[PDB]
Amino acid sequence: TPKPKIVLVGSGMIGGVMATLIVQKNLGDVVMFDVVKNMPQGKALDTSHSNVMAYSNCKVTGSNSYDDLKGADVVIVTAGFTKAPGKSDKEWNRDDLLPLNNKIMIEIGGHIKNLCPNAFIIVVTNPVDVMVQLLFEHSGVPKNKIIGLGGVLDTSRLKYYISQKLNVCPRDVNALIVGAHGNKMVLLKRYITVGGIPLQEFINNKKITDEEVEGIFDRTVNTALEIVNLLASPYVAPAAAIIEMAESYLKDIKKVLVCSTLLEGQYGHSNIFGGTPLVIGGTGVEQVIELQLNAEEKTKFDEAVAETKRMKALIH
Amino acid sequence: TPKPKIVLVGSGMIGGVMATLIVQKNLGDVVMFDVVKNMPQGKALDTSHSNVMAYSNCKVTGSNSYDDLKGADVVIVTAGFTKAPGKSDKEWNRDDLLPLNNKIMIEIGGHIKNLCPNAFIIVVTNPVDVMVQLLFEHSGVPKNKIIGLGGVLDTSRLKYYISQKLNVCPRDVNALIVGAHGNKMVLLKRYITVGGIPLQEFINNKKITDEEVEGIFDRTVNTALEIVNLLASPYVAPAAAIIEMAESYLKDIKKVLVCSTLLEGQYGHSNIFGGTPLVIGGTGVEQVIELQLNAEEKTKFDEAVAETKRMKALIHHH
Amino acid sequence: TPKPKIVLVGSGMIGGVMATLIVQKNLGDVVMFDVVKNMPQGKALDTSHSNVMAYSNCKVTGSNSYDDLKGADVVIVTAGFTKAPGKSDKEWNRDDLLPLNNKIMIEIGGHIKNLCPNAFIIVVTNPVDVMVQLLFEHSGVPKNKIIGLGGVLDTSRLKYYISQKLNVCPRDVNALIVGAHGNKMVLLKRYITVGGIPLQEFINNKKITDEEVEGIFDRTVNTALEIVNLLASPYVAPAAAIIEMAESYLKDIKKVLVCSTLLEGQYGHSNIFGGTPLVIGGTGVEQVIELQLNAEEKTKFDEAVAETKRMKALI
Amino acid sequence: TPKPKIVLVGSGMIGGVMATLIVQKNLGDVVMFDVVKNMPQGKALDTSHSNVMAYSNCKVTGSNSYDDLKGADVVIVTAGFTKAPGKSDKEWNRDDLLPLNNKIMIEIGGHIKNLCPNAFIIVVTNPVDVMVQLLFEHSGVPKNKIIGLGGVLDTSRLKYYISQKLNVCPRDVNALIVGAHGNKMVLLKRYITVGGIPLQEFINNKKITDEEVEGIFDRTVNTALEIVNLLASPYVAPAAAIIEMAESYLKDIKKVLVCSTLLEGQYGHSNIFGGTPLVIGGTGVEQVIELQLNAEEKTKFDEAVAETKRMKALI
Ligand SMILES: NC(=O)C1=CN([C@@H]2O[C@H](COP(=O)(O)OP(=O)(O)OC[C@H]3O[C@@H](n4cnc5c(N)ncnc54)[C@H](O)[C@@H]3O)[C@@H](O)[C@H]2O)C=CC1
Ligand SMILES: NC(=O)C1=CN([C@@H]2O[C@H](COP(=O)(O)OP(=O)(O)OC[C@H]3O[C@@H](n4cnc5c(N)ncnc54)[C@H](O)[C@@H]3O)[C@@H](O)[C@H]2O)C=CC1
Numbered sequence A: 001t002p003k004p005k006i007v008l009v010g011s012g013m014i015g016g017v018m019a020t021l022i023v024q025k026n027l028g029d030v031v032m033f034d035v036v037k038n039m040p041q042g043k044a045l046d047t048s049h050s051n052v053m054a055y056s057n058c059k060v061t062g063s064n065s066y067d068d069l070k071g072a073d074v075v076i077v078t079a080g081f082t083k084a085p086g087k088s089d090k091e092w093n094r095d096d097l098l099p100l101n102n103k104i105m106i107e108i109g110g111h112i113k114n115l116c117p118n119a120f121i122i123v124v125t126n127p128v129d130v131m132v133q134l135l136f137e138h139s140g141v142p143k144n145k146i147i148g149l150g151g152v153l154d155t156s157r158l159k160y161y162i163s164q165k166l167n168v169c170p171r172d173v174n175a176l177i178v179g180a181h182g183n184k185m186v187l188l189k190r191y192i193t194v195g196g197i198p199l200q201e202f203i204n205n206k207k208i209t210d211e212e213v214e215g216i217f218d219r220t221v222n223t224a225l226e227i228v229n230l231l232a233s234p235y236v237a238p239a240a241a242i243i244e245m246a247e248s249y250l251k252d253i254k255k256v257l258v259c260s261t262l263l264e265g266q267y268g269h270s271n272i273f274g275g276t277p278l279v280i281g282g283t284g285v286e287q288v289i290e291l292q293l294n295a296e297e298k299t300k301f302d303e304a305v306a307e308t309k310r311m312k313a314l315i316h
Numbered sequence B: 001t002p003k004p005k006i007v008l009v010g011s012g013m014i015g016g017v018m019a020t021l022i023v024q025k026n027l028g029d030v031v032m033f034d035v036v037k038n039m040p041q042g043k044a045l046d047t048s049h050s051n052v053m054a055y056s057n058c059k060v061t062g063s064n065s066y067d068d069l070k071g072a073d074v075v076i077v078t079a080g081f082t083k084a085p086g087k088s089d090k091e092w093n094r095d096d097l098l099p100l101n102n103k104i105m106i107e108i109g110g111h112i113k114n115l116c117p118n119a120f121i122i123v124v125t126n127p128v129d130v131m132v133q134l135l136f137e138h139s140g141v142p143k144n145k146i147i148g149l150g151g152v153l154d155t156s157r158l159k160y161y162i163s164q165k166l167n168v169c170p171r172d173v174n175a176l177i178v179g180a181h182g183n184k185m186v187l188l189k190r191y192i193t194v195g196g197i198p199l200q201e202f203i204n205n206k207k208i209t210d211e212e213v214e215g216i217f218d219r220t221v222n223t224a225l226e227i228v229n230l231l232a233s234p235y236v237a238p239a240a241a242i243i244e245m246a247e248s249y250l251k252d253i254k255k256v257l258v259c260s261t262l263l264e265g266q267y268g269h270s271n272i273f274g275g276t277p278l279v280i281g282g283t284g285v286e287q288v289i290e291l292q293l294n295a296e297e298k299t300k301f302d303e304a305v306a307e308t309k310r311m312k313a314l315i316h317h318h
Numbered sequence C, D: 001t002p003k004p005k006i007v008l009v010g011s012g013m014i015g016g017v018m019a020t021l022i023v024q025k026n027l028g029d030v031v032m033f034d035v036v037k038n039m040p041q042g043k044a045l046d047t048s049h050s051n052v053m054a055y056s057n058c059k060v061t062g063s064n065s066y067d068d069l070k071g072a073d074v075v076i077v078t079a080g081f082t083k084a085p086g087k088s089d090k091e092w093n094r095d096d097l098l099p100l101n102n103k104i105m106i107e108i109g110g111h112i113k114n115l116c117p118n119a120f121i122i123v124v125t126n127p128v129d130v131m132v133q134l135l136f137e138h139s140g141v142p143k144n145k146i147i148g149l150g151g152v153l154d155t156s157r158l159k160y161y162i163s164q165k166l167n168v169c170p171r172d173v174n175a176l177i178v179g180a181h182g183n184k185m186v187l188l189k190r191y192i193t194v195g196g197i198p199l200q201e202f203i204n205n206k207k208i209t210d211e212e213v214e215g216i217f218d219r220t221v222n223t224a225l226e227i228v229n230l231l232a233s234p235y236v237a238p239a240a241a242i243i244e245m246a247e248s249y250l251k252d253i254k255k256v257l258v259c260s261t262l263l264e265g266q267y268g269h270s271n272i273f274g275g276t277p278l279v280i281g282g283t284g285v286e287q288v289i290e291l292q293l294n295a296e297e298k299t300k301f302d303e304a305v306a307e308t309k310r311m312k313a314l315i
């Protein structure tokens, strides 16, 4: 009243699930944007009919024009490159990626600056902790108005695996994974709770062993690789995580969610984005919570941020 | 208590969205079954993590074994061929696919009979009015325990396009589409209401014209084609429609939903499945409602069933 | 963002259920206003804890001050009285209370005009079709920003009773009740559908008779009496009906809902509020739909509006 | 599976809100049972209409016959005295209700044994930790199939108050209150977290002081009295807490919820019910979690169970 406008910049796998979930939850009008012609229009048409089943009323439209950024309340960026040429046959590089995805962020940021400078922006494009800062820089939006997906998704894996071993509801496990999305993500064993009860109590009661916990941490780290091996880059859980973040903003819920945000001295770091618990409210990032890490924990957090800094320095 | 078991026989595009929606609604444990190796397992793992975001607790597992049909409460069949070397990259059709999908329904039917004969079955595989009857015949399930997807999806399109012209909530439009899923679907102009009000009133008040209605009618018939030409065969709205049907069963809601069901004299037809409103409750199909069509509407219904019979008669064509 | 502000002017039985449902649906911050001291503060404290179980974040506060209307997005008025003192329940009716309630609507109107002139207003206080016009006049709010509760609740009963005879989901019955809320309500048999199918088809197939339909019409008209003769106040269904209306506004859903709205030549009547299908969207009443009634139906609508005029000219 | 049946034994303030919430969530058919004639039939009629607004299909019926217990999946017991007949508020003595509510548990227990021995039972009647055990004994139901309301409600207050000081979503605060429902509830400061983060981190950062936390504890213990002083006993949040417990069973969610349950050695205590975290799934109580309390926390638990034992000894 008047209906929020959500622009999906990128209408691939994650984009399609997000449009579906937005309709289920009656969250706002959706523009599915892509550079690929016709594809976002077909997805939007199919998704728009699902309003009837959902008892919702969200316009869902497809676009190949950046003009549709005008009026956006929320912009979600999943746009990016992948795959490789000639290369033979398993040596697809990392890494350079990174200039190609940077050029995408330059293009998107320029239009955000021109067309929707007051939007709340969520960046998903990998490596997320690098790309979110690039978009921040190219778009000119305030620091409280842009974040990156990482912790909500990474902790959903950890929560889920622990919950299946302990035979409890998945959401009754709480856990924090910080620093960066990716292989350097910091899993904080000390902050795992189950129904509000420290994980250690379940270990002492022999409900789960130290070994099993370590195998679950390794599985959490290997999950994207596990699913890519079987199928493709994951998309259902990533979309669910993003919509949880977007909804906290649109409904001023003030959920505490771990996301990539600009660090300004926290954990000893500045001029860089990193994963940390934060509060998402109707004005955007309302609080950035700095965890009271011990020495071993801070050193893993430093390694996570050093890798973000490394990749960022490959951009010229 | 103790949590329904839902098996998706076919874990493609439609299968993926259904698993996603089942988790969102906390509806039951899900087995994602497919003949394609690794694909269901990967989709099931990705989907299982979304339980955290949804505050749900549905196990989601992937399978390449029919044994996992054991104990199913609901079985949803989207399984179908399936193209080979040739002969590309579009050479597919569906006329020649009829004997091939027949063979799929035989295989699935024999397994349902041995492993989950008390399941409620929803068939999606095209042409659905043909395939649902084939599954009924080879599974042995009672007539009230098997239906095909059609009307809920077809009417969603008609309801949607009308609501956008009249500027009202999509679900506040009501419409009935009967006969068969496909190009011979019967769109009943007489039975369209908007907030309970006959469509003819909005026409009389020049809010929409007769030409605009016919244009919306053509767009509804050709919607699958329109989306295929932009993208691929539709899957988000089909999944939503199937889940609304499954939920009515699992929660005994008793929604009146247009679905393909065994006709036993209704509309003058027997020994065939066709689309008609019916009531889905906790026992399956509780009521089959026969619309009181005029002569001109009945002729159209006749044409829909004739086309289903034509295709059924090609399950052994060479 | 920023979170809507909903003020409940009246915090009795219906107010209490409305605040509960607002939290369940996470629809906005709630101010529970009443003239009774401490009571709305007590209900608000209780209700605020239910945010935890609902995974919501709605502030629920109690107020005895009209100043809390400031910056309201939605104002729901149930302030007045349920039953006449000295009067029993075997007679449960209405009258002599009009002038008092007009003095309430004058007083509430004054405050709305000053503190929340851009709010969407829902009037619930009986006789609703009279009371909503009074508040409209004294609040100065535009015609598309104020409606009365009537048809959504009246039609919920008709839909429910028909759904139970025919063994289908209650919401799969559609029905229109118009004219006025109360004993002169116009139940339109022609407009009833079940799963989009004319009721007449089920009458033809002997699933329900013309006389059972007549008995359901009577039961619908007399439902409030039936409840009061058993123990008081419909409040649960009235609250769910109002929240359905409020939500359609707050979420721009554009539902077609029968409510009390200013008539401007529709059905032949003007300068009066009447019950008719409307579209509620993000800007308030976006459309008023005039049913194409036949002479027998238009005469019943006339008798409904005439009873509203009989009470309007009498304060 | 497919329409569960929920029987509400007691259709007073909490029963009315519970029936409302079951319909909203489409959780099951509802029987509103009470010894008061006509009243639950009136409440059930009002409530049934709300199925339309909710898009639900739950039958809601009122009853004065215990026959309605046959086929129950869940039975919720709020039946009981709130004050002794012929006494004033100045003469209030909580122990006075023990023999009066004991008689009610005996009556209800005999009918459960005969009619729905496989139902999951949730006891609400105060003092709940005593009453739940009386119903256990008289009903003969297995220990995994009967629990008392306490910790879900008590922790909702603590969670809510902390969340308002810290400006976060109420449900993102986690806390455990154990031992008994009432003034000797054990508020475990050590176990409080906010977004999974120990409460102490927020103290260290001066977002909240130790004194503020103490005043929150006091407020939490005294909330029912606060609400009564304004106008209670509380009913919205109690109803929501009970529905969260019943839903975890009906949908096999396996939520961890603090409820009153038979102690068989946990915390050094036996032959008594006390509040502790536990898992509710489709078979009932699937796990009872014994917290690893330190010595000081342990003595607070002992003091709470001592008071349950004192009151049980009165019978
Ligand atoms: N941050 C996180 O926790 C996670 C991040 N991801 C990342 O999310 C991104 C997207 O994932 P999927 O949807 O699975 O990939 P996808 O390949 O299916 O979608 C990418 C879409 O972006 C489009 N695109 C390319 N350039 C564009 C431009 N300039 N403007 C608009 N659209 C453009 C492509 O046409 C494609 O449709 C990838 O970078 C992936 O690595 C994936 C999972 C988790
Ligand atoms: N009834 C209706 O209103 C509509 C019907 N459809 C039909 O639904 C079907 C599926 O649609 P999509 O999911 O988009 O197709 P899809 O090709 O993505 O999914 C079909 C899946 O079935 C699998 N399969 C083949 N044989 C199998 C077997 N014996 N057991 C288990 N899986 C097997 C394939 O491996 C494939 O993964 C098609 O026949 C399509 O024409 C689509 C839309 C609407």
Ligand SMILES: NC(=O)C1=CN([C@@H]2O[C@H](COP(=O)(O)OP(=O)(O)OC[C@H]3O[C@@H](n4cnc5c(N)ncnc54)[C@H](O)[C@@H]3O)[C@@H](O)[C@H]2O)C=CC1
Residues within 6 Å of the ligand: C009, C010, C011, C012, C013, C014, C015, C033, C034, C035, C036, C078, C079, C080, C081, C082, C104, C123, C124, C125, C126, C128, C149, C150, C153, C181, C233, C234, C235, C238
């Ligand atoms: N339009 C409809 O379909 C229906 C209308 N109603 C009507 O709605 C009204 C409320 O019903 P209940 O909540 O059951 O009544 P209730 O008596 O329980 O609550 C009314 C509240 O309004 C308060 N109040 C009185 N004057 C006030 C003022 N100056 N400002 C603020 N608050 C004031 C009273 O203190 C009382 O708490 C009654 O007029 C009732 O007859 C009830 C059902 C349906």
Ligand SMILES: NC(=O)C1=CN([C@@H]2O[C@H](COP(=O)(O)OP(=O)(O)OC[C@H]3O[C@@H](n4cnc5c(N)ncnc54)[C@H](O)[C@@H]3O)[C@@H](O)[C@H]2O)C=CC1
Residues within 6 Å of the ligand: D009, D010, D011, D012, D013, D014, D015, D033, D034, D035, D036, D078, D079, D080, D081, D082, D104, D107, D123, D124, D125, D126, D128, D148, D149, D150, D153, D181, D233, D234, D235, D238
């Ligand atoms: N366990 C907890 O955390 C809490 C417990 N309570 C308790 O819950 C109980 C109910 O609370 P309210 O609904 O507010 O009280 P209420 O007085 O409104 O409802 C109690 C109902 O039980 C009925 N009743 C009495 N004996 C009965 C019997 N033999 N069979 C059937 N019905 C019978 C009465 O007619 C009355 O309608 C009280 O004992 C109260 O102390 C209240 C809040 C929290």
